[PDB]
Ligand binder design. Sequence first.
Ligand SMILES: [Fe+2]
Ligand SMILES: [Fe+2]
Ligand SMILES: [Fe+2]
Ligand SMILES: [Fe+2]
Ligand SMILES: [Fe+2]
Ligand SMILES: [Fe+2]
Lengths: 190, 190
Amino acid sequence: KSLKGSRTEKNILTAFAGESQARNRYNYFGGQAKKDGFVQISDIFAETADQEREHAKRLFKFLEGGDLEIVAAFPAGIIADTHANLIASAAGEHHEYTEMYPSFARIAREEGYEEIARVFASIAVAEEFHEKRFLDFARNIKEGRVFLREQATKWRCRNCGYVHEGTGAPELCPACAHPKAHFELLGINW
Amino acid sequence: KSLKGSRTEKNILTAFAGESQARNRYNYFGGQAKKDGFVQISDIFAETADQEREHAKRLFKFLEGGDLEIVAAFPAGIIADTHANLIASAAGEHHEYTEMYPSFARIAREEGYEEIARVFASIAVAEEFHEKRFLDFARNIKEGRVFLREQATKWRCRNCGYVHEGTGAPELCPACAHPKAHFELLGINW
Ligand SMILES: [Fe+2]
Ligand SMILES: [Fe+2]
Ligand SMILES: [Fe+2]
Ligand SMILES: [Fe+2]
Ligand SMILES: [Fe+2]
Ligand SMILES: [Fe+2]
């Protein structure tokens, strides 16, 4: 049925507004992460921003047109160091998957919008993993484990693919000469 | 010392030529992988192409100028199905890390170009992992394990970040509605 006049219609636009701002914030944090010498984290922020773009698109497509007024609170700033940005981002993700989306989903189910409710619940799953990544990286930074680990392991240069074996990433990639900032733990998800 | 007239100078340009063609081939294969419904593989081809761009840049920067003639054989085509493209790509990587770069490195050391020799040896390491990825993905396709596994595991939608738990990726992402093609095994390399 139509969304016109329902609380769900307002909630969808509210979610769209938040998703849109998150995309921008994450891209800015990605830029800051690059400046702070954290390439993997920078690319993660960029990827997360792209995924928020997709959450927003799905939501946007449910709308039926017209200008709708919404009342909502958003983070007024700010861009800080990468650790701080990761913490702030995780906090935003947390509110989304623990409070906002579950609430929007429940209201959607109550008003009879089952498909939309399932979408809100599904997006919440994505946001929870987004938070996990942000918290994990913040922890790595705080503990000084981004480029150094207890036992020897494999590190991959994101710039050229060079693989280094050791307790920590090298100061300079021996293949492409790019700085340590480009290294990440070698991952194999296949 | 100067590279002018050395065999290493020729080898560097030869490597640059091959690296350059590999970049194009991989980008084309990436496009084909997208058409075949393999998003993770498509992005891997694109990333690999970007890394070949960097191998080429490091090599290019060693050169001292002028037009140099080279004699070398290259793959004349072709673009086929993704499995075939992965196999062909792996074969190219194999020649590079088992024959070409080790030979270029040895000649470089013999002519007194230690830094360049180390770069050739280092690039070879990158190419070996490139091959591993290509062979692994080709095997997944051949065995029908790209989107389905024996035991239940976690699958991530590359488009929106949704996480699905089960033996296989869903036909449609419940969050962004994109097809199964966008799913990959959830990876955590940090
Ligand atoms: Fe989102
Ligand atoms: Fe998110
Ligand atoms: Fe590198
Ligand atoms: Fe290469
Ligand atoms: Fe390669
Ligand atoms: Fe999705």
